[PDB]
Amino acid sequence: NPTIIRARAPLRLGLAGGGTDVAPYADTFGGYVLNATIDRYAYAVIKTLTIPAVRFVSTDQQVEKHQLISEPLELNGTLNLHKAVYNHMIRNYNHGKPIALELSTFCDAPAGSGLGSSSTLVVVMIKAFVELLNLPLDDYAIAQLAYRIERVDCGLAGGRQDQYSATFGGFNFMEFYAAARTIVNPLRIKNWVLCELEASLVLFYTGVSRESAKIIQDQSDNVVSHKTAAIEAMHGIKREALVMKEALLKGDFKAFVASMRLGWDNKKNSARTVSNAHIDEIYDAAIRAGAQAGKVSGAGGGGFMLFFVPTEKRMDLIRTLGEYDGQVSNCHFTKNGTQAWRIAN
Amino acid sequence: NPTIIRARAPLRLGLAGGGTDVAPYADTFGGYVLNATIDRYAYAVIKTLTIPAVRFVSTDQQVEKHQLISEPLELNGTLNLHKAVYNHMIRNYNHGKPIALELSTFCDAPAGSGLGSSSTLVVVMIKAFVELLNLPLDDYAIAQLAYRIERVDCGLAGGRQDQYSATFGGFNFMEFYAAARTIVNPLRIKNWVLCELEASLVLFYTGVSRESAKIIQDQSDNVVSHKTAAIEAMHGIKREALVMKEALLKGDFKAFVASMRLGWDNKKNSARTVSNAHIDEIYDAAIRAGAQAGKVSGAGGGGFMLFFVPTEKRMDLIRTLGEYDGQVSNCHFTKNGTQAWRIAN
Ligand SMILES: Nc1ncnc2c1ncn2[C@@H]1O[C@H](COP(=O)(O)OP(=O)(O)NP(=O)(O)O)[C@@H](O)[C@H]1O
Ligand SMILES: Nc1ncnc2c1ncn2[C@@H]1O[C@H](COP(=O)(O)OP(=O)(O)NP(=O)(O)O)[C@@H](O)[C@H]1O
Ligand SMILES: [Cl-]
Ligand SMILES: [Cl-]
Ligand SMILES: [Cl-]
Ligand SMILES: [Cl-]
Ligand SMILES: [Mg+2]
Ligand SMILES: [Mg+2]
């Protein structure tokens, strides 16, 4: 009787505030991020095995297989996230006795796409074990656990917003404090506002960013080394996230676009590689085609861009982007957080 | 006090049965179609004007402007659908007195994409007038009206499935009879089945089909001219749509894929240009990459293809398709039918 479980968690568009969730900034001044989940998913699958082994498979089809032993798996640099989730679950919920299983992942967008894929993948792996082991972990616990596994257990530097979008789902405004304290504010946005927003957003995939780690390091350095102007850009990122949140609650699209423009300027000034000449060319083309505001979705340097465009200019913008390197798509938001289902047993 | 209304209606994936909804077949034997709406939309906007004129704007940015006169607009071959919707509403709900307004449309996929864009656009224009005039038209009435406007008023040959997906939303199994009698069967599919299905579907945009009219004409000719083998292919299309419907209700994915394979064979045999060498090359590549079944979504000859692929082979299939001409995407279903909202007054 093999058991087969799948879980999924939606990826996310960073709307405002990204950068203020980097460790030194959040811990010192408090960070704010406004984000929203979209119709693209990370997935994890658990299949119990009929042989004494553990198998890990990743999105880019890396594979590791081990013999069933009663010591933690070493985090040797290959598939550390899968191993660390596995180690945590075995130690904390199965009294340290290994379980014969294959843990596999796949994702609707590769890492560096600006959709929060890395942390979303950690979240979905945890969710799959929550279903397999029937664990009483609520959304806060899963998001806090995903954070621990990635940033502490696997020692990976990064932000704090992606764990929460992946778990809770929908539009959320997050407040980040010291000692890993995060408050999630679910935003119940009016239906008309959501329809108007999707009607006015165009996404543009520019390719994989290879700048995220560098951007996060530079943003962290801003605070640690007291780079005054760059810190002030970050305070601007924080301020505009709150402005945007209130604009969405009031259905004030004029304020929404003005806060995105100021936010994008602030984000570019916070780190040298957030934008580059190639990204600025697209941005400028989008503006003269009729977009009113835009930004890179994730840390920066590539991945998805999003543009706000009035409906009368929408098709013009879509045609213009067709002439650049990348893929255009509409933007559809999802309300559901991470979900699991069973296929066998 | 200008009034601004927007409406949207979701586009659709043809899952099974397409072709049996062509006029001679449906009227003679009864047609069946299984389809489901996706996360891509057609839109219409109505703005009342402060000058005595009527303006029409289309998705590909064609524009017509007329003086406010008290006779129906001529269907001269430019923007006939917009004009005919306008004429109908003025004659039937405004006692024949013209209304000064701009009616504009735009769409997340161009015609020939295989997503039912043409009829979906007619539906959304009607919905916008339903909101502007506060009309008591339910979903059946809007779908029957969209059919009348396109196929009778504008004399355009085509199918019957798209008007119903655009209006009702979700997964529907439609039964088509003579005298324009259609029964919509909403399918309440289990959540796990829907998640499993989205996890197993990959979409692939091959470019605009220019075969739809020819395919529909050939399918119609099959019946009118008694082409025995080609009629029998169509009976197979019909049969497999019912099989697929029952497979989705039972969560039987083995039967689902077998009915899609038989359906695709039957569809190709119903009309010479449903597939071609270019489409078959993609299909074959998808199969050897691990897809278990696939098809062209609309009438055929191009547009979106969909593939069912087991989750363990999903990323392999995605990588393989990356090497062909077209765009890959995930498949996310929507439950909502056509919706309208107000921006001013
Ligand atoms: N200095 C660093 N060294 C090594 N890895 C890092 C460093 N900083 C961040 N990372 C990690 O690199 C991984 C890839 O992240 P990234 O390229 O941002 O793709 P993503 O997960 O799609 N998020 P984003 O694209 O920014 O929305 C994440 O797990 C980060 O935690
Ligand atoms: N013989 C014909 N002559 C002129 N127009 C036709 C004929 N047959 C069909 N049409 C119309 O051509 C238009 C374009 O349809 P089509 O290329 O199928 O794009 P679509 O609306 O995206 N549907 P599909 O792509 O098949 O899902 C529709 O309004 C049809 O009604
Ligand atoms: Cl972000
Ligand atoms: Cl952001
Ligand atoms: Cl179809
Ligand atoms: Cl079909
Ligand atoms: Mg990403
Ligand atoms: Mg189409």
Author numbering:
A (entry chain A), B (entry chain A): 2 to 346
Sentences from the paper on this structure:
Here, we present the structure of WcbL from Burkholderia pseudomallei. A critical step in the synthesis of heptoses is their 1-O phosphorylation, mediated by kinases such as HldE or WcbL. We report that WcbL operates through a sequential ordered Bi-Bi mechanism, loading the heptose first and then ATP. The protein forms a head-to-tail dimer, with the two active sites facing away from the dimer interface, in line with the native molecular weight predicted from size-exclusion chromatography.
Repeated attempts to soak or co-crystallize the substrates M7P and ATP failed. The structure of WcbL bound to AMP-PNP suggests that the ATP may bind in a manner that blocks access to the sugar-phosphate binding site. Superimposing the locations of AMP-PNP and mannose shows that the location of these molecules is compatible. Indeed, the reactive atoms (O1 of mannose, Pγ of AMP-PNP) are located in positions compatible with the expected reaction (nucleophilic attack of O1 on the γ-phosphate). This suggests that the locations of these two substrate analogs in the structure are representative of the true ligands.
